[PDB]
Amino acid sequence: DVAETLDPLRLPLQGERLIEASAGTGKTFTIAALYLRLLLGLGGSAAFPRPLTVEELLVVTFTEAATAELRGRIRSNIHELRIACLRETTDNPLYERLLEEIDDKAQAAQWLLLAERQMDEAAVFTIHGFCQRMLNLNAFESGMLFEQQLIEDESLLRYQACADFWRRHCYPLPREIAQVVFETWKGPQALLRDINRYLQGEAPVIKAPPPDDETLASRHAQIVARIDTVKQQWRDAVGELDALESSGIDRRKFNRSNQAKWIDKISAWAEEETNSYQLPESLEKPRHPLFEAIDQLLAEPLSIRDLVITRALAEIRETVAREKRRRGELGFDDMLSRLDSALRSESGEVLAAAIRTRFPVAMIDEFQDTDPQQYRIFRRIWHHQPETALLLIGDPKQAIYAFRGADIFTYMKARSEVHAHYTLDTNWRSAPGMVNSVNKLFSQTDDAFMFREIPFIPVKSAGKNQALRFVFKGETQPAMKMWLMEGESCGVGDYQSTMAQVCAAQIRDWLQAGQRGEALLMNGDDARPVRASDISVLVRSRQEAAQVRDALTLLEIPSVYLSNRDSVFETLEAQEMLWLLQAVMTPERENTLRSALATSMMGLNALDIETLNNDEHAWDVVVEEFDGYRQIWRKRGVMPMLRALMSARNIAENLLATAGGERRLTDILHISELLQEAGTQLESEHALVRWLSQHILEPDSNASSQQMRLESDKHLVQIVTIHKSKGLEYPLVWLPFITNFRVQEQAFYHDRHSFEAVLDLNAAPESVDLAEAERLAEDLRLLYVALTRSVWHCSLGVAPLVRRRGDKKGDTDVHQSALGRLLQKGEPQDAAGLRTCIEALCDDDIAWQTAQTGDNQPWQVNDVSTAELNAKTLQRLPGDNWRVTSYSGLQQRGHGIAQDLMPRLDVDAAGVASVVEEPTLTPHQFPRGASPGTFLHSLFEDLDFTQPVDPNWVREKLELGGFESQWEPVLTEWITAVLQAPLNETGVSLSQLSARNKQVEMEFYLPISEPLIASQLDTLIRQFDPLSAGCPPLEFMQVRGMLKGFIDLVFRHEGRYYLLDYKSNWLGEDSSAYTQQAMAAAMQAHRYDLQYQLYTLALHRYLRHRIADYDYEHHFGGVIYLFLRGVDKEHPQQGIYTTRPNAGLIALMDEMFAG
């Protein structure tokens, strides 16, 4: 017992070691040390068998920021100790004591070099990261999915489950029963608020659970039966108006009758006031008659609660689980839970060993916060195992996360199993005066943390800090100062209004006296004025924080609640912005707009609003303004719009100058950052507006919508919670409400023998007594952390608090609080009895005063400022724009992201279809659009023009394409008709083209230097092409760069090369629309003519390039357009179109590019 003062370098790196890193004892410096030792296998007898790799030293922390810092601190130490190995000389502690243990500085340098470059894979994860990691590796054993989705809901999944339970369980109930339930809970909402704690993590063991089968009906019967029989032993016993004590006035007849009418058709376990007329009491105030059965009724409770509950969480759990499986999702409780089952199951050894190898030695940090599930997994892998080491480090005095499931008991359990104990004796980080005061306080009684297994061993304060002191308006102040309210009695109300006031006063008192250089934090002969950034107010709950923030704010002392969870969505700004987006979204409606302008964010006046209502031209002015913002919104988005708005109305600049404006601004900006995300997830502005409403209505979701703290708060007295403060350090700290306690009423305790979480579904005084114990057992634990946060000094508020409505009978249930229990050494005290106990211990480091309230609204601080700024202004200019167009300088958008998702989509088609279904399928009735158009293009992507059209291949093509098989005849006949179709003249017909003379889907890139002006090109395009005579053209604007383009088909009729572009278009009824006229019409209609000139200009450049010494009119003679539809076996020139570029056009057009 009583741990060995831990000497890192001499710690035996071999199996099971428990390390207690007291308050700020350098737990981190220790871990790193131990990490290095392991890497280089250092030590000696207390060393590890062999050297380990970065990817073998398992370290698990609880926080995410934790593993980051831990991972960071280590890469550094390695980089140093490694460097200090190359120099074989180091002049900085730790390292030197390390090199003395090194035998070959040259090797360690190498070994270390690897550890350095290996860090981006250091086995330092969180409890949760470790789990899903082992799990996902040994999937078979854990029955895990290779693709798990991390669930988020649950908080909802849970309510839904709790309600599914209420519907299938309570709805079918018959009135008599239903009502009973109702009087236990009104709805599913109420049932959850009672069982929510459970349902989460390890189900607690239910002391005295209901018979594994009692139905709601069962119990109900027994109860009603037990009730109704006594309705008899009174219905027929009410002929007795008996006799033989005092005080029961004849107004007992009032008592009497009140049960004769208690005879309803039942429906309510509820019964009333007969405690008197029992018998086991009538004597307390031969013994008496036949109604002592009542003595038996008010003996063992008449409830339905425990049964339902037991059924609820039991069923609710599995309901939620099932739902997760189905969804294929996984939560965190599950993550480390599934891992615990795996190590439990038969196939638990292959898993235990597997892990064990990967991580032969693991360091568990912040262990005082584990849980049965964790510790189990842990020992199931490393407990009693040669060739391995389990370094368990944390501090039981700081285990304050009970509410999330950190079971201090499972720690004490682990404390029992591992016999090797170690403590860190030196408290770096803090002042001697402090450490002395904290040690004194927690040394009062024995077992201050009241748990023989969690002893408190004082700690030596570090020498480098022996100089620390805090002087104020004269001399040095005591490390610890107790402020005591006056009086005998004191309610929770008082001890807050008054303590916050007091606290507030003392803060401005240090601050003001700080600017006057009278408040100094000094390290011997060095000093500095205390600044808001140095004060800190620990608190227990949101309210308490507010309570403080208010008294502070009442003294112009700005502050910031570091533990704030509210979301940006329920800020008055969110609402204002929404009204704005509604104005932007419709400046037409005179109302919503005015409304927008009325928002505090717009900083308008009452006068402004007025005039602006009586001047119609200035109104439209604004309307225009907003109509522009909607434009900015439609085109660039919300963020660009909002910022555009602010810049005009000069919002940011004004707000910042409006007290508390900075907060309001950051929040508005924030909203925008969220309103921006949401934008790129909905295709309509209105959809976003909607998006807002909901979020404003049902918020608090992620931590992504949590409020961003200001970058100035680093100069604001910080008010945080004992919890967020664990690990944090503060020059000066204040504990305004450190006396409160709040007694535990819920009978949830841990059995002191079996160390198990038991849930007595019956308020058994015995078990509640036990729980209430564990309560302050944790309050002390919190108290320890609170005092531990300050460096130079800490002053807390104490008062003769009293909860018991017992008229100040020398009560002061102060002894029921962690701090009171330590001051009044256990025993309760007089109001003044406290005042005397405080004086008892109180010198050099400890000192008290009376709660001296005060007033002086000023934080009497002034300012100065000189804004000599300006923003660089670039002297360059846009000028040219290099892009890569592609006969898209034509086709107006809509194809936005379309030519992106499908580079070869039949972009030339689009639309819907209707009643043109005529009961005889023809190529005109073939489904219109892009999806079907590309299907057609597809067919000819790899067809055997040469041979005949196999119907099965066609049936198969439609079958896969999602079309109806009943299209094969029409289609198989349609294809061929187009194949054996005569192109221009002498022969030429797709079917005559063999593979070797075909090149399908050619992708070209025609560089285009010297801006291509739409007009300049329209001129020559005119002179040579009679088609482009319909001159609307030049519909695009200047473009420098490249020219993409796909050619459906380019073939050669042994003599020349050609350009074929299959074009599935029209819904234009039949044949008559595919005539040499109609075709040449749609041609300009879609300006396809350009496609020609461009495409050919490419084939030109290509052929010229390939065919070494080629000529246009000797190798070209092409250009064929096949409008697939309207093409029959015997109606040539219909459906097909042909053109042959002027050759003189291609000439000028080619050089048009590079001049």
User: Residues 620, 1061, 1089, 1128: which is the catalytic one?
Assistant: 1061
CB of 596 to DNA, least distance (A): 16
CA distances from 267 to 178, 227, 234, 782, 1101 (A): 9, 11, 18, 47, 96
> Contacting DNA (CB under 7 A), which of 138, 255, 762, 922?
255
Find which of DNA, Ca ion, none residue 1061 binds, CB within 5 to 8 Å per kind: Ca ion
- Residue 440, Cβ neighbours under 10 Å: how many? 17
> Contacting DNA (CB under 7 A), which of 232, 543, 946, 965?
543
- 3-state DSSP assignment of residue 527: coil
In angstroms, rounded to a whole number, what is the distance separating the alpha carbons of residues 92 and 87?
A: 13
Asked whether position 460 contacts DNA by CB under 7 A, the answer is no
CB of 1124 to Ca ion, least distance (A): 10
CA distances from 1008 to 1025, 1044, 1142 (A): 22, 11, 21
Q: 20 or 1048, CB closer to Ca ion?
A: 1048
> Contacting DNA (CB under 7 A), which of 187, 248, 524, 858?
248
CB of 1032 to DNA, least distance (A): 52
Give the count of residues interacting with Ca ion (CB under 5 A).
2
Q: Which residues neighbour 849 within 8 Å (Cβ) at sequence distance 6 or greater? A: 481, 482, 483, 484
Which of 539, 484, 605, 531 is CA-nearest to residue 852? 484
CB of 883 to Ca ion, least distance (A): 23
CB of 1055 to Ca ion, least distance (A): 25
Residue 464 assigned ligand-binding role: no
Which of 571, 573, 546 is CA-nearest to residue 561? 546
Q: Report whether 310 contacts 761 (CB < 8 A).
A: yes
Q: 807 or 863, CB closer to DNA?
A: 807
Q: Report whether 201 contacts 371 (CB < 8 A).
A: yes
Alpha-carbon torsion (156, 162, 166, 169), positive or negative: positive
Residue 1062 assigned ligand-binding role: yes
Q: What are phi and psi of 183, to 5 degrees?
A: -75, -5
Does the annotation mark 1061 as catalytic? yes
Find which of DNA, Ca ion, none residue 276 binds, CB within 5 to 8 Å per kind: DNA
In angstroms, rounded to a whole number, what is the distance separating the alpha carbons of residues 539 and 561?
A: 10
Binding mask 37-66 for DNA (x = CB under 7 A): -------------------------xxxxx
Q: Report whether 298 contacts 275 (CB < 8 A).
A: yes
CB of 1057 to Ca ion, least distance (A): 18
Give the count of residues interacting with DNA (CB under 7 A).
45
Report the alpha-carbon angle 796-517-479, nearest 5: 25
Residue 483 assigned ligand-binding role: no
Which of 964, 1028, 980, 1018 is CA-nearest to residue 1132? 980
Q: Which residue is nearest to Ca ion (CB)?
A: 1061
Candidates 462-470, 568-576, 1043-1051, 1126-1134: pick the segment binding Ca ion (CB under 5 A).
1043-1051
In angstroms, rounded to a whole number, what is the distance separating the alpha carbons of residues 984 and 1137?
A: 9
Asked whether position 850 contacts DNA by CB under 7 A, the answer is no
Asked whether position 1125 contacts Ca ion by CB under 5 A, the answer is no
Structure tokens given for 18 = 């428990």
Find which of DNA, Ca ion, none residue 805 binds, CB within 5 to 8 Å per kind: DNA
Asked whether position 805 contacts DNA by CB under 7 A, the answer is yes
Q: Report whether 847 contacts 480 (CB < 8 A).
A: yes
Q: Report whether 204 contacts 198 (CB < 8 A).
A: yes
Candidates 716-724, 875-883, 945-953, 1007-1015: pick the segment binding DNA (CB under 7 A).
716-724
Cα 176 to its chain centre, rounded Å, is 45
Which of 373, 478, 394 is CA-nearest to residue 434? 478
Candidates 252-260, 870-878, 1040-1048, 1108-1116: pick the segment binding Ca ion (CB under 5 A).
1040-1048
Find which of Ca ion, DNA, none residue 742 binds, CB within 5 to 8 Å per kind: DNA
Binding mask 1051-1090 for Ca ion (x = CB under 5 A): ----------x-----------------------------
Alpha-carbon torsion (1124, 1127, 1129, 1132), positive or negative: negative
Asked whether position 1124 contacts Ca ion by CB under 5 A, the answer is no
> Contacting DNA (CB under 7 A), which of 10, 73, 723, 1140?
723
Candidates 18-26, 694-702, 800-808, 829-837: pick the segment binding DNA (CB under 7 A).
800-808
> Contacting DNA (CB under 7 A), which of 28, 126, 1075, 1084?
126
Q: 740 or 934, CB closer to Ca ion?
A: 934
Asked whether position 900 contacts DNA by CB under 7 A, the answer is no
- 3-state DSSP assignment of residue 1092: helix
Find which of DNA, Ca ion, none residue 680 binds, CB within 5 to 8 Å per kind: none
Q: 124 or 462, CB closer to DNA?
A: 124
Residue 25 assigned ligand-binding role: yes
CA dihedral 731, 734, 739, 745 (to 10 degrees): -80
Edge-to-edge strand list for the sheet holding 846-850: 559-561, 717-721, 535-539, 730-735, 790-798, 480-484, 846-850
Q: Phi-psi category of 552—alpha, beta or left, where left has phi over 0 and alpha has psi -120 to 50?
A: alpha
Asked whether position 765 contacts DNA by CB under 7 A, the answer is no
CB of 981 to Ca ion, least distance (A): 17
Residue 428 assigned ligand-binding role: yes
CA distances from 1142 to 278, 386, 855, 1054, 1146 (A): 119, 90, 97, 22, 7
- Alpha-carbon Rg of the chain, whole angstroms? 42
Asked whether position 395 contacts Ca ion by CB under 5 A, the answer is no
Find which of DNA, Ca ion, none residue 697 binds, CB within 5 to 8 Å per kind: none
> Contacting DNA (CB under 7 A), which of 17, 413, 531, 540?
540
Strand 421-423 with 389-394, pairing? unpaired
- 3-state DSSP assignment of residue 957: helix
Asked whether position 183 contacts DNA by CB under 7 A, the answer is no
- 3-state DSSP assignment of residue 406: coil
Show the 3-state SS of 912-932.
Answer: CCCCCCCCCCCCCCCCCCHHH
Q: Report whether 686 contacts 586 (CB < 8 A).
A: no
Find which of DNA, Ca ion, none residue 543 binds, CB within 5 to 8 Å per kind: DNA
Candidates 107-115, 653-661, 1046-1054, 1103-1111: pick the segment binding Ca ion (CB under 5 A).
1046-1054
> Contacting DNA (CB under 7 A), which of 97, 344, 516, 565?
565
Residue 24 assigned ligand-binding role: yes
Residue 28 assigned ligand-binding role: yes
CB of 405 to DNA, least distance (A): 8
CB of 1027 to Ca ion, least distance (A): 18
Asked whether position 128 contacts DNA by CB under 7 A, the answer is yes
- 3-state DSSP assignment of residue 303: coil
Q: 329 or 544, CB closer to DNA?
A: 544
Residue 397 assigned ligand-binding role: no
Binding mask 150-179 for DNA (x = CB under 7 A): ------------------------------
Q: 599 or 1096, CB closer to DNA?
A: 599
Give residues in contact with DNA (CB under 7 A).
62-66, 126-129, 246-251, 254-255, 273, 276, 285, 332, 402-404, 491-493, 540-544, 563, 565, 720-721, 723-724, 740, 742, 803-807
Which positions are annotated as active-site residues?
Answer: 1061
Give residues in contact with Ca ion (CB under 5 A).
1048, 1061
Known binding-site positions for Mg(2+): 937, 1048, 1061-1062
Known binding-site positions for ATP: 21-28, 428
